[PDB]
Amino acid sequence: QKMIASAFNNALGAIQDGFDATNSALGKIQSVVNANAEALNNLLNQLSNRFGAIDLSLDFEKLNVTLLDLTYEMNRIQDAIKKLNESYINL
Amino acid sequence: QKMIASAFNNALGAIQDGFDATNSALGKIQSVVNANAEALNNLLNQLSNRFGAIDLSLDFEKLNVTLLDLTYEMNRIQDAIKKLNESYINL
Amino acid sequence: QKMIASAFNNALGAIQDGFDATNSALGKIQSVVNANAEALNNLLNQLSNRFGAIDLSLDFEKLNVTLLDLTYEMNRIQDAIKKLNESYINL
Amino acid sequence: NQKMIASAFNNALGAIQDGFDATNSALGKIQSVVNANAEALNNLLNQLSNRFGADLSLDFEKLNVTLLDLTYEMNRIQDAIKKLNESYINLKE
Amino acid sequence: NQKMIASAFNNALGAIQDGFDATNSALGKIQSVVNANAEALNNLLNQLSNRFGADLSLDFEKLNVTLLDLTYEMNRIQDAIKKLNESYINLKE
Amino acid sequence: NQKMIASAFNNALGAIQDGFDATNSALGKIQSVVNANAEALNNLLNQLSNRFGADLSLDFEKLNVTLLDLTYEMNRIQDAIKKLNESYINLKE
């Protein structure tokens, strides 16, 4: 029954690291995707000006930049990691 | 043997929520990344016109926007969540 | 004790597929997000030229494109998948 | 029924933004047409004064021609459309 | 061998797109050169008629000068390149 | 303390880039002002030679007016800012 328990707890560690790396990637993805979204939006404005400094005014009906929010997800994963913590000893 | 079984089933719930949040993030990521890709592509076309309304024609050899498709992934995760469902009772 | 062990190993397979699909999505996300980042940056340069071929010079203080790197994450997940492999038999 | 309410909500959000976009487009056309028409009227005014050099000197204290700007408005509606995007509900949640 | 076949496939996809891009670039140069040359010929025609005002009146029923458009084509090839991108195989799958 | 060191590091990275951006902006203004001023001086030179057509012929062997380029520099600093971005530390790691 030690091999099971040991294999078990050994698997939980592995799992938590998996979700840990995932949450990290998620965090790294929101950052880049958003950083680029801002670069894009800020580019739209710098264009609306120079196409006027010269109708050459942009069509924003199809120039809508979206931002990503993964806080809800990353928190839920953190709960899972924490919950998994609830499965170990007791002899 | 209840603590094990209980710890086990307790861990599965946690796992499924982890993969659930992941699949959600994946869904949220395809949406934003694609939405922005379209905003970018639609911006290219609105530029090819105004650089002609004035060779100022863009170079699309390096202006290729790519779309992301995570359906294969999200489905596989849904299978995993479902499969995990196959490990619980039996006394 | 077979049902437990069987349910266990049955759950590990499911888990590894979950992390496998995740790592795949991560790989698919870095690719698209980066591909689009390059399309965006290359668009900035093609613009700095045509706004000069006509101060209409862009403001790069807010035109900074970022690239995403998930190698650290994807490797850690691969370790988890491998580690999980360490929990199976022994009668 | 959350899905229903949420699907219903996200559904109307789309419509609203489309509505606010259509208003912005509208406002852009108005600024273009009204200003072009003001500018032509202003040019008529300059030509008439010279033409009348044949006093028949027009009174400019009452021929004020205005113009532009709704871009403040344009941008304000543009933000609302963005903040509206931050309101879509994740049915998965 | 899936990896092999897939790697081989993705590999040729790259080459094709590069091929279709090179064709688009080519077609763009042709529209630029042929039109510029048509336009210069057309201007020669207008100058000659005036010059000959010294009948030596040119017959324009047979001096038709055409021009432009391959952008339809340009865009068509541009799509193929995109739909080609939707075909790369995920070796991880 | 890794977090501390890392937070401290990422923190200074921001400042550096801001610094390198401010330098690029600066260099852009200088190219704009110095060239505009060279170009005006050069135009003064062409006008003076004609004006003096009243020998009072200026010696151009010693009136060399230079100009432009810092874009090489501009781009070089622009890269450093990007490579700097590839250095931020993931505190989660």
Coordinates of N, CA, C and O in Angstrom, one line a residue, chain C residues 37 40-42 44-45 60 63-67, chain F residues 17 20-21 24 74-88:
Chain C
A37 N 3.1 38.8 -34.8 CA 4.0 39.8 -34.2 C 5.0 40.3 -35.3 O 5.2 41.5 -35.4
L40 N 3.3 42.3 -37.9 CA 3.1 43.7 -37.4 C 4.3 44.5 -37.4 O 4.3 45.6 -37.9
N41 N 5.4 43.9 -36.9 CA 6.7 44.7 -36.9 C 7.1 45.0 -38.4 O 7.6 46.1 -38.6
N42 N 7.0 44.0 -39.3 CA 7.4 44.2 -40.6 C 6.5 45.3 -41.3 O 6.9 45.9 -42.2
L44 N 5.4 47.9 -39.6 CA 5.9 49.2 -39.0 C 7.0 49.8 -39.9 O 7.0 50.9 -40.2
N45 N 7.9 48.9 -40.3 CA 9.1 49.3 -41.1 C 8.6 49.7 -42.5 O 9.1 50.7 -43.1
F60 N 7.9 55.0 -32.3 CA 8.1 53.6 -31.9 C 8.2 53.4 -30.3 O 8.4 52.3 -29.9
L63 N 5.2 51.6 -30.2 CA 5.0 50.6 -31.3 C 5.9 49.4 -31.1 O 6.4 48.8 -32.1
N64 N 6.1 49.0 -29.8 CA 7.0 47.9 -29.5 C 6.3 46.5 -29.5 O 5.4 46.2 -28.7
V65 N 6.6 45.7 -30.5 CA 6.1 44.4 -30.7 C 6.9 43.4 -29.8 O 8.1 43.5 -29.8
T66 N 6.2 42.5 -29.1 CA 6.8 41.6 -28.2 C 6.6 40.1 -28.8 O 5.5 39.8 -29.4
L67 N 7.6 39.3 -28.5 CA 7.5 37.9 -28.9 C 7.3 37.0 -27.7 O 7.8 37.4 -26.6
Chain F
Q17 N 15.0 50.8 -21.4 CA 14.2 50.9 -22.6 C 13.7 52.4 -22.7 O 13.7 53.0 -23.8
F20 N 16.5 54.4 -23.7 CA 16.8 54.3 -25.1 C 15.8 54.8 -26.1 O 16.1 55.2 -27.2
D21 N 14.5 54.8 -25.6 CA 13.5 55.4 -26.5 C 13.7 56.9 -26.5 O 13.6 57.5 -27.6
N24 N 16.3 57.9 -28.8 CA 15.9 57.8 -30.2 C 15.0 59.0 -30.6 O 15.2 59.6 -31.6
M74 N 19.4 54.9 -35.0 CA 18.0 54.8 -34.6 C 17.6 53.3 -34.5 O 17.1 52.9 -33.5
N75 N 17.9 52.6 -35.6 CA 17.5 51.2 -35.7 C 18.3 50.3 -34.7 O 17.8 49.4 -34.1
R76 N 19.6 50.7 -34.5 CA 20.4 49.9 -33.6 C 19.9 50.0 -32.2 O 19.9 49.0 -31.5
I77 N 19.5 51.2 -31.8 CA 18.9 51.4 -30.4 C 17.6 50.7 -30.4 O 17.2 50.2 -29.3
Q78 N 16.9 50.7 -31.5 CA 15.6 50.1 -31.6 C 15.7 48.6 -31.3 O 14.8 48.0 -30.7
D79 N 16.8 47.9 -31.8 CA 17.0 46.5 -31.6 C 17.3 46.2 -30.1 O 16.6 45.4 -29.5
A80 N 18.3 47.0 -29.6 CA 18.6 46.8 -28.2 C 17.4 46.8 -27.3 O 17.2 46.0 -26.4
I81 N 16.4 47.7 -27.6 CA 15.2 47.8 -26.9 C 14.4 46.4 -27.0 O 13.8 46.0 -26.0
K82 N 14.5 45.8 -28.2 CA 13.8 44.6 -28.4 C 14.5 43.4 -27.7 O 13.9 42.6 -27.0
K83 N 15.8 43.3 -27.9 CA 16.6 42.3 -27.2 C 16.5 42.4 -25.7 O 16.7 41.4 -24.9
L84 N 16.3 43.6 -25.2 CA 16.1 43.9 -23.8 C 14.8 43.2 -23.3 O 14.7 42.7 -22.2
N85 N 13.8 43.3 -24.2 CA 12.5 42.7 -23.9 C 12.6 41.2 -23.8 O 11.9 40.5 -23.1
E86 N 13.6 40.6 -24.5 CA 13.8 39.1 -24.4 C 14.5 38.8 -23.2 O 14.8 37.6 -22.9
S87 N 14.8 39.7 -22.3 CA 15.5 39.5 -21.0 C 14.6 39.6 -19.8 O 15.1 39.3 -18.7
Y88 N 13.4 40.0 -19.9 CA 12.6 40.1 -18.7 C 12.5 38.7 -18.1 O 12.4 37.7 -18.8

